[PDB]
Design a binder for this molecule. Structure first.
Ligand SMILES: C[C@H](CS)C(=O)N1CCC[C@@H]1C(=O)O
Ligand code: NA
Ligand SMILES: [Zn+2]
Ligand SMILES: [Zn+2]
Ligand SMILES: [Zn+2]
Length: 219
């Protein structure tokens, strides 16, 4: 199942679901429809959902995916690099993410960049920004200036998150500064999209900071 909702103009938020030990988690990402084709950020959470996802893209827009950008090495972000490459899309990731994928023997992106990069596709513009370590050492966010949408990915927890989620590769002591960096640089954001679960509640950044503090206080 893939849920797709228009967020602003040609920018859409898509959500897929993956159940872990009785807890049904949602993974949120976005895709942009341009005159040159569709740009997909991250990927459906689960390989058995890739075809269903692009099938929905065709049903709704009758267009082709020409680019895929992974915001970190995990399955819900970089899991589709092989698939999107196979169907003709130009794939990207940061060099740090590439190093992690290589180490884990996971498919890698065709092109890599040094943490930050500004993109221009058709008449659309967006930028990938590295705020520092948090959920992982390589996590990046994507900013769409025209739509005023900040795709936070997993460094941003949903306002209803019970805990920080998977922290086996996290840097909790650096996470607060990284989130403060995002907040300061994209202060005028109309929409901030958390990587998991409910993203609509815009207190997501506040709750994230709350969860980090809670974790640290408990030592
Ligand atoms: C929970 C994260 C996504 S934030 C996840 O999918 N992981 C963490 C380690 C195993 C799996 C993966 O990406 O390989
Ligand atoms: Na590899
Ligand atoms: Zn992750
Ligand atoms: Zn995630
Ligand atoms: Zn809170």
């Amino acid at each position: 199942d893939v849920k797709i909702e228009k967020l602003k103009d040609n920018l859409y938020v898509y959500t897929t679901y993956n159940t872990f030990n009785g807890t049904k988690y949602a993974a949120n990402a976005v895709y942009l429809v341009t005159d040159k084709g569709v740009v997909v950020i991250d990927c459906p959470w689960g390989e058995d959902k890739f075809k269903s996802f692009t099938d929905e893209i065709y049903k709704k827009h009758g267009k082709k995916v020409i680019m895929n950008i992974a915001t970190h090495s995990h399955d819900d972000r970089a899991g589709g690099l092989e698939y999107f490459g196979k169907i003709g899309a130009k794939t990207y990731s940061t060099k740090m993410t590439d190093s992690i994928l290589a180490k884990e023997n996971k498919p890698r992106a065709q092109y890599t960049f040094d943490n930050n990069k500004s993109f221009k596709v058709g008449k659309s513009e967006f930028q990938v920004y590295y705020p520092g370590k948090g959920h992982t050492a390589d996590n990046v966010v994507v900013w769409f200036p025209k739509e005023k949408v900040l795709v936070g990915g997993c460094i941003i927890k949903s306002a209803d998150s019970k805990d920080l989620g998977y922290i086996g590769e996290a840097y909790v002591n650096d996470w607060t500064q990284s989130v403060h960096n995002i907040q300061q640089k994209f202060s005028g954001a109309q929409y901030v999209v958390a990587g998991h679960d409910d993203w609509k509640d815009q207190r997501s950044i506040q709750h994230t900071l709350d969860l980090i503090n809670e974790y640290q206080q408990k030592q």
